[PDB]
Design a binder for this molecule. Structure first.
Ligand SMILES: [Cu+2]
Length: 129
């Protein structure tokens, strides 16, 4: 009944885990995200973006053109359920979201939207009954 999890990244294009389970008993869930590499966000930035799996492609396409100042996420993108800002080496961030925003009928994917990272840096998130 833990309603928090920690996902790390580094100077590669992989997350530390590729599956996150959110307990349906949680009212809110927190994802802590840390970058343990030594390269900065200009060249090796990472973020954690959550969307329904069918929407990842379009969110990633539009987000790549939104710019670093918009964390590579289109401003007001209604397909993004929750996201963190981009972080570089030695930085940490987190995001908390309401578990009621998720449905048991849908599939979800978390991924990094820094240009060129989404194909490898992605995982599945599911609501655990
Ligand atoms: Cu990344």
């Amino acid at each position: 009944a833990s309603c928090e999890t920690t996902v790390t990244s580094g100077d590669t294009m992989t997350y530390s885990t590729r599956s996150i389970s959110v307990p349906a008993s949680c009212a809110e869930f927190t994802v802590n995200f840390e970058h343990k590499g030594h390269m900065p966000k200009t060249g090796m930035g990472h973020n954690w973006v959550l969307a329904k799996s069918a929407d990842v492609g379009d969110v990633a396409k539009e987000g790549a053109h939104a710019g670093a100042d918009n964390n590579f996420v289109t401003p007001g993108d209604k397909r993004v359920i929750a996201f963190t800002p981009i972080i570089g080496g030695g930085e940490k961030t987190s995001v908390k979201f309401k578990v009621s925003a998720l449905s048991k009928d849908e599939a979800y994917t978390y991924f990094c939207s820094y240009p060129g990272h989404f194909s490898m840096m992605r995982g599945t998130l599911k609501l655990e009954e």
